[PDB]
Write a protein that binds this ligand. Structure first.
Ligand SMILES: Nc1ncnc2c1ncn2[C@@H]1O[C@H](COP(=O)(O)OP(=O)(O)O)[C@@H](O)[C@H]1O
Ligand SMILES: Nc1ncnc2c1ncn2[C@@H]1O[C@H](COP(=O)(O)OP(=O)(O)O)[C@@H](O)[C@H]1O
Ligand SMILES: Nc1ncnc2c1ncn2[C@@H]1O[C@H](COP(=O)(O)OP(=O)(O)O)[C@@H](O)[C@H]1O
Lengths: 735, 238
């Protein structure tokens, strides 16, 4: 069966054309590490690349870069063949000839300062007719050689010479413009794109396979997320690299024209796509198309909605087409569009976290070179509420500030601009600070759905609850068969109570990182926003967004905070229930336990929670967290003192044992006060980057004791009453 | 690289055509304080002005007034050159000839009570073909000389004489009507206008620079504020 085929997968490296394979492949075809390898593709063409050993990616696959993607005319989800070529190659001359498709507005010599620093210390083989992208000069341009020495025998070496003419050639339709968006041009969302990879690659790359079987492929995919998340770009990328026609109608181009022909344009948009099969249809804005919730106005609005419904209800097999739609909120879409056969498949895209925003930084700033002291890791940590488009706009605006500080004193007034100076427009630290301070975030009040960055080492002590949480939520996931064999269901939620200021959010956040799952945050103020708003529909989709991003964990903070505004044990004439208590448990009653989701309930006063929440079946696990012991506060303090420098004479064992009625927050505020007071001495002595023992005695003066003695007994009597292990604590069975 | 170029910035003074420079510039081109300086612009034309020392404005820039803005056909965000001219100039006669573009509804003698109190105690050099605005009579009117003694050698002194004819000339499209709104015609908002200065000057004065790079300029600016704040005038001036 010709055991040489390989599946095509997107690579992870950000370098030039370098492929990644697995460890048995190295000995399968007798290759070494640093050797030149030849690849054979379609259209009767060859390629040259470099093999790289990797053991983490997969067991049997290749990771092929964007350059040779388009160079070899091979798309994702295709067949490919590889073979060794241990031949000595020593290049001697190269012909340079760019294409005027993208070389516009750039004059001067762009071959001695632009291609020169990129080829050295690379040792990458080149082939006659290669298409590769390079960076420099606030823009990117490809390259293509039309006449040179016959390939093979081309290796980048200093002895090679160069010669330019200065007459670009006209491009043809045989190749594809690499300047378009590819699969590797989307960052910050890896779990969401993998679902599309296993949803769209089959019906598009294998039309006859689905035409021969009785499986009905999805006819509609709904895209979620705040505006600017990248919904349009995902649709543009999944269609341009599959050989399928892409047709885009955004949202208002239909309503802009006169009534009567707007429906005809929509109808012909579907008909033109069928002829160019396989094809795809993407709708950028649809919430403005079908506002059939509260609008109830306009005669032609419902006509357009019904026309769209008719056009997609009638989508029989015939040809291959996928309809894509994008919006801002799931509640802004006509429910008639969510029926089966129209939009039965849905996907939600959230705001990327630090590890996602980091990637979206370089994926946009790759075209400009940075300095040796400018890093994107620290700048991506302060931003938390920025949309994926916010970061791209921030980079573009920071480029303007970087060039403005020098263009005034340069004063180069001319018609054309050379490329010898546009590349030297480096950006420094002073520009990102101003750009990030001036930027205006868009999604600041959306649901906080990100992956935390805290582990078990950040929480000191509390070893008693660590085992209880470890034996409850990882066992059903890691060993599902054991729970099914006995015949009982695993627990669905854990609620804990204790004095305020004991890291009730830290253990809920850390449990998500060690289990490799998402994390949601529904705090108290976020739970009091609909008690007055008289809108019970917002609590509806907070569970949908959690179950779609499985696995995930639901966190509730100060669960009784609503009762404080209404009273408490007695309060008004009512009891301990309101318009929001009855909505928390009604939705989680009917959910499937089999789903990889969890509910965490954090509260300070457990005597106010209604017994209906604590009923067996919804929240039966009760854990009481007491005050930290002497041996735990040392770890708690050293976890917070990890970032700030610590002197050698700083003793922590004695400092931790002198606190008795201090909770977790009381230690953190003491450390904050000490390290703040350290800066005062450093500034006053300026007219040293290390803390000393003198900054402590002046900091423990402001030590606060929030947890008084009245609440300790109140919590202990409740915990003992709810535990009740007396009378039959030690008994031996006869048989 | 011809070390004589200077960036163009809006001045802060409310006087006639007086430029402001920095302290090293005074010794760079061996000028004194009270000397007549000559400026060279585009369209092959010259200008005359007075240098003023300032240490608070900036480190390397000029602060050029509204009169010679339109006189020298130089807009904000452009290049300019300056040079000293220590030549003794003693004017003797001037020709007065306004343009009927803005002189409407006003009759009588407007040259002996209107231009007279404005020229004394000023000692400002004038050039053949200058466009400057003056005030008086609940309105403002510019001035333009078409035929006089060949510039240089024109200094405001009491010994100079004046003579009027009374036949205004028709204007042309070579110059711009100074009666329109300029950058210095907006007051009370300094921090807001500086943002527009660094947002609109680049894509407008440098089209090829943005057409050659991959930076996407903003395609829309939203103006806020209560009605009447001056949103229309800012857009008209920029
Ligand atoms: N996740 C992302 N990866 C790469 N680029 C992005 C991402 N999100 C936004 N961008 C950039 O910002 C722009 C956002 O526009 P787009 O997402 O197409 O509109 P919408 O946000 O309505 O889907 C994109 O054109 C892209 O250049
Ligand atoms: N075991 C612990 N390890 C690390 N930090 C802790 C620990 N216990 C309490 N803290 C600190 O207490 C602070 C309060 O956390 P929080 O989750 O708000 O407490 P609560 O559960 O009362 O809301 C946290 O910032 C955390 O650093
Ligand atoms: N900040 C200002 N500076 C100078 N003139 C102003 C200012 N604000 C208002 N004006 C004067 O008052 C009027 C403001 O009207 P305008 O700003 O054009 O309408 P709007 O206030 O709706 O933008 C203009 O005629 C302008 O001359």
């Amino acid at each position: 069966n010709r055991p040489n085929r390989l599946i095509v997968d997107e690579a992870i490296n950000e370098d030039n054309s370098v492929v990644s394979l697995s460890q048995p492949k190295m000995d399968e075809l007798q290759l070494f590490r640093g050797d030149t390898v030849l690849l054979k593709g379609k259209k009767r063409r060859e390629a040259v690349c470099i093999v790289l050993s990797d053991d983490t990616c997969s067991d049997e696959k290749i990771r092929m870069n964007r350059v040779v993607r388009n160079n070899l005319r091979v798309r994702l989800g295709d067949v490919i063949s590889i073979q060794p070529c241990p031949d000595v190659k020593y290049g001697k001359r190269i012909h340079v000839l760019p294409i005027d498709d993208t070389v516009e507005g750039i004059t001067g010599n762009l071959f001695e300062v632009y291609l020169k620093p990129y080829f050295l210390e690379a040792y990458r083989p080149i082939r006659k007719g290669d298409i590769f992208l390079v960076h420099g000069g606030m823009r990117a341009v490809e390259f293509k050689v039309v006449e040179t020495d016959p390939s093979p025998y081309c290796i980048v070496a200093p002895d090679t010479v160069i010669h330019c003419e200065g007459e670009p050639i006209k491009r043809e339709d045989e190749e594809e413009s690499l300047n378009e968006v590819g699969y590797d041009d989307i960052g910050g969302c890896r779990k969401q794109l993998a679902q599309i990879k296993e949803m769209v690659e089959l019906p598009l790359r294998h039309p006859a396979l689905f035409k021969a079987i009785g499986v009905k492929p999805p006819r509609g995919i709904l895209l979620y997320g705040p505006p600017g998340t990248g919904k349009t770009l995902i649709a543009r990328a999944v269609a341009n690299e599959t050989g399928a026609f892409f047709f885009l109608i955004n949202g208002p181009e239909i309503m802009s024209k006169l009534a009567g022909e707007s429906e005809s344009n929509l109808r012909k948009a579907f008909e033109e796509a069928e002829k160019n099969a396989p094809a795809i249809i993407f709708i950028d804005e649809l919430d403005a198309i079908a506002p059939k919730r509260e609008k109830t106005h306009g005669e032609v609005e419902r006509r357009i909605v019904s026309q769209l419904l008719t056009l997609m209800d009638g989508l029989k097999q015939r040809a291959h087409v996928i309809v894509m739609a994008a919006t801002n909120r799931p509640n802004s879409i006509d429910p008639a569009l969510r029926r089966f056969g129209r939009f039965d498949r849905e996907v939600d895209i959230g705001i990327p976290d630090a590890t996602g925003r980091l990637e979206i930084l370089q994926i946009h700033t790759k075209n400009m070179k940075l300095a040796d002291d400018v890093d994107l890791e620290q700048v991506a940590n302060e931003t938390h509420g920025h949309v994926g488009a916010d970061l791209a706009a921030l980079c573009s605006e920071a480029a303007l500030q970087a060039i403005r500080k020098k263009m005034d004193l340069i004063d180069l007034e001319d018609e054309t601009i050379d490329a010898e100076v546009m590349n030297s427009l480096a950006v420094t630290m002073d520009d990102f600070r101003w750009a990030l301070s001036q930027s205006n975030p868009s999604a600041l009040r959306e649901t906080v759905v990100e992956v935390p960055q805290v582990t078990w080492e950040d929480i000191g002590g509390l070893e008693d609850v660590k085992r209880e949480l470890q034996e409850l939520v990882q066992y059903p996931v890691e060993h599902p068969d054991k729970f099914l064999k006995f015949g009982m269901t695993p627990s669905k939620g854990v609620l804990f109570y204790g004095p305020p200021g004991c890291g009730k959010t830290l253990l809920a956040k850390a449990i998500a990182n060690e289990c490799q799952a998402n994390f949601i945050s529904i705090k108290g103020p976020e739970l009091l926003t609909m008690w007055f708003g008289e809108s019970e529909a917002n609590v509806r989709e907070i569970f949908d967004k959690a179950r779609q991003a499985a696995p995930c964990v639901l966190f509730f903070d100060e669960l009784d905070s609503i009762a404080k505004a209404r009273g408490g044990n007695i309060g008004d004439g009512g009891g301990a229930a309101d318009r929001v208590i009855n909505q928390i448990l009604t939705e989680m009653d009917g959910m499937s336990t089999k789903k990889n989701v969890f509910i965490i309930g954090a509260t300070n006063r457990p005597d106010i929670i209604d017994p209906a929440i604590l009923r067996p079946g919804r929240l039966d696990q009760l854990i009481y967290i007491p005050l930290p012991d002497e041996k735990s506060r040392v770890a708690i303090l050293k976890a917070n003192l990890r970032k700030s420098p610590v002197a050698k004479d700083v003793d922590l064992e004695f400092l931790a044992k002198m606190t008795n009625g201090f909770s977790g927050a009381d230690l953190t505020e003491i450390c904050q006060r000490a390290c703040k007071l350290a800066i005062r001495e450093s500034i006053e002595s300026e007219i040293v980057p290390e803390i000393r023992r003198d900054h402590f005695e002046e900091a423990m003066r402001f030590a606060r004791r929030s947890v008084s003695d009245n609440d300790i007994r109140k919590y202990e009597m409740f915990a003992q009453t709810l535990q009740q292990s007396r009378g039959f604590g030690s008994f031996r069975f006869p048989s």
